[PDB]
C-alpha cells in the first residue's frame, strides 16, 4: 500500500546536503510515495524532535543523515521499535543502534585509493601536508583523513620499503567553501613549506584554492578524500586539482530510498547493516566519466 517516507537531514548548509535532500525527495516521489522532509539546521536537539514528529506523522520508512553518531541512537531505536524501517545515510550512526542499514560513501577505501594515487603521482617526494578537516568529532571525517594518510604510508612501504610524511598543520572548515578559505589562510601564514593540501571534502579545498591563489603560493598539490563535486572535477580536468574521492549525494539518497522501500514491502530481507557505494579515486585520467557541468552537485 501507500505509505509515507520521512527524510531527516542534519543540515542543508553545504552543497552536498542540499543536493542529497532534493534527490531523496525526488526518488520517493518517482517511486510513488509521499515524502515528509525536515532540516535540523545543524542542531542535534532539533533533529531528535524532527524524528519524533515524523514518526507520529506516520512515516513507515525514515531516511536520516544524523547530526551525531551517538546522540540520535535513542531516537532511532524508538522509531524502529514503533515499526519504522530506518536507513541511515552519509553520516555515521553508532552501529549498535537498531536500523536496517547505513548507506554511505566507501570512505576508508576511497582514502586508500586516493593516497595510493598521490604516491603514483609524486613518487618519493617529501610531502608537507596542510590538512583541512570538517568537524571536530566527526567519524567520517576521521576515516577520510586517516584513510588518505595511511594510504600514502602503505603505498610508500610497497614501493620504496620505507615511509615518511609530515602534516604541517590542521584547520577546521566545517565542510564549506568559506570555512576552507579561512582555515587555509591561517595555514599559509603559519607554514612556508606546504606542498600538498588534503581536504576531507572538495568544498573546503575549493575555498582553500582561493587563499592559495591570493597568496601567490605555487607548487601545492590539491587532494580531496570526497566528494567529486562538479567544480573540483572541472579543475581536475584542467590539471589544476589532483584527485578526489567519490561520494555522490544523489546516489546515496537513491540507494537508501530504493532499498528502504523494498524492505518496507517485504521484497528484500537480511540486508547487510552497512551498504557502501562504489569507491573511486577520480583524477585527470578518468574524470571525463564523472564530470557533468550541468549536474546538481
Instruction: By CB under 6 A, name the binding residues for ligand TLZ.
Output: 14, 16, 90-91, 134, 138, 140-141, 175, 201, 203, 226-227, 247
Which string of DSSP letters, residue by residue, matches 96-133?
A: TS--SEEEE--HHHHHHHHHHHHHHHHTT---EEEEEE
| Shortest Å distance, C-beta 268 to ligand TLZ | 25
| Shortest Å distance, C-beta 257 to ligand TLZ | 17
CA distances from 214 to 83, 182, 192, 241, 267 (A): 54, 12, 15, 16, 55
Helix (H) / strand (E) containing 276: strand 274-276
Q: Give CA–CA dist 53/137, Å, rounded.
A: 27
| Shortest Å distance, C-beta 118 to ligand TLZ | 19
Q: Give the contacts of 257 (CB within 8 A, at least 6 positions apart).
A: 5, 24, 27, 28, 31, 61, 63, 87
How many Cα atoms within 13 Å fall on the side-chain side of residue 67? 23
User: Longest C-alpha distance within the chain, in Å?
Assistant: 63
Q: Please say which residue, 139 or 169, places its beta carbon nearer to ligand TLZ.
A: 139
Q: Please say which residue, 68 or 264, places its beta carbon nearer to ligand TLZ.
A: 68
Q: Please say which residue, 35 or 224, places its beta carbon nearer to ligand TLZ.
A: 224
| Shortest Å distance, C-beta 66 to ligand TLZ | 8
| Shortest Å distance, C-beta 138 to ligand TLZ | 5
Q: Give CA–CA dist 260/137, Å, rounded.
A: 28
Q: Give CA–CA dist 169/128, Å, rounded.
A: 9
Q: Please say which residue, 159 or 231, places its beta carbon nearer to ligand TLZ.
A: 231
Asked whether 35 and 29 are in contact (CB, 8 A), the reply is yes
Length of the chain: 297
Q: Please say which residue, 38 or 247, places its beta carbon nearer to ligand TLZ.
A: 247
| Shortest Å distance, C-beta 156 to ligand TLZ | 26
| Shortest Å distance, C-beta 207 to ligand TLZ | 12
Closest to 274 measured CA to CA, from 262, 259, 287, 289: 259
Q: Please say which residue, 141 or 151, places its beta carbon nearer to ligand TLZ.
A: 141
Q: Please say which residue, 155 or 184, places its beta carbon nearer to ligand TLZ.
A: 184
Amino acid at each position: 500500500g501507500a505509505f509515507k517516507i520521512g527524510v531527516s537531514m542534519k543540515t542543508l548548509s553545504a552543497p552536498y546536503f542540499a543536493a542529497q535532500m532534493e534527490a531523496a525527495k525526488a526518488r520517493g516521489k518517482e517511486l510513488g510515495y509521499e515524502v515528509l522532509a525536515t532540516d535540523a539546521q545543524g542542531k542535534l536537539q532539533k533533529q531528535i524532535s524532527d524524528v519524533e514528529d515524523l514518526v507520529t506523522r506516520g512515516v513507515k520508512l525514515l531516511i536520516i543523515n544524523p547530526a551525531d553518531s551517538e546522540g540520535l541512537v535513542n531516537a532511532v531505536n524508538n522509531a524502529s521499535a514503533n515499526g519504522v524501517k530506518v536507513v541511515v545515510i552519509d553520516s555515521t550512526l553508532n552501529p549498535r543502534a537498531n536500523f536496517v542499514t547505513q548507506v554511505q560513501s566507501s570512505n576508508s577505501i576511497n582514502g586508500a585509493l586516493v593516497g595510493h594515487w598521490v604516491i603514483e603521482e609524486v613518487g618519493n617526494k617529501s610531502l608537507k601536508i596542510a590538512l583541512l578537516s570538517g568537524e571536530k568529532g566527526n567519524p567520517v571525517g576521521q576515516e577520510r583523513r586517516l584513510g588518505v594518510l595511511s594510504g600514502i604510508i602503505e603505498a610508500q612501504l610497497r614501493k620504496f620499503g620505507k615511509a615518511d610524511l609530515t602534516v604541517v598543520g590542521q584547520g577546521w572548515g566545517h565542510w564549506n567553501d568559506e570555512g576552507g578559505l579561512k582555515a587555509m589562510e591561517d595555514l599559509l601564514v603559519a607554514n612556508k613549506d606546504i606542498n600538498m593540501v588534503l581536504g576531507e571534502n572538495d568544498s573546503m579545498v575549493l575555498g582553500a584554492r582561493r587563499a592559495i591563489e591570493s597568496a601567490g603560493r605555487t607548487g601545492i598539490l590539491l587532494v580531496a578524500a570526497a566528494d567529486a563535486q562538479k567544480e573540483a572535477l572541472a579543475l581536475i580536468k584542467q590539471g589544476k586539482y589532483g584527485v578526489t574521492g567519490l561520494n555522490d549525494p544523489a546516489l546515496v539518497a537513491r540507494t537508501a530510498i530504493d532499498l528502504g522501500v523494498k524492505v518496507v514491502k517485504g521484497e528484500v530481507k537480511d540486508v547487510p547493516k552497512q551498504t557502501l557505494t562504489t569507491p573511486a579515486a577520480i583524477t585527470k585520467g578518468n574524470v571525463d566519466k564523472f564530470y557533468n557541468p550541468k549536474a546538481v552537485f
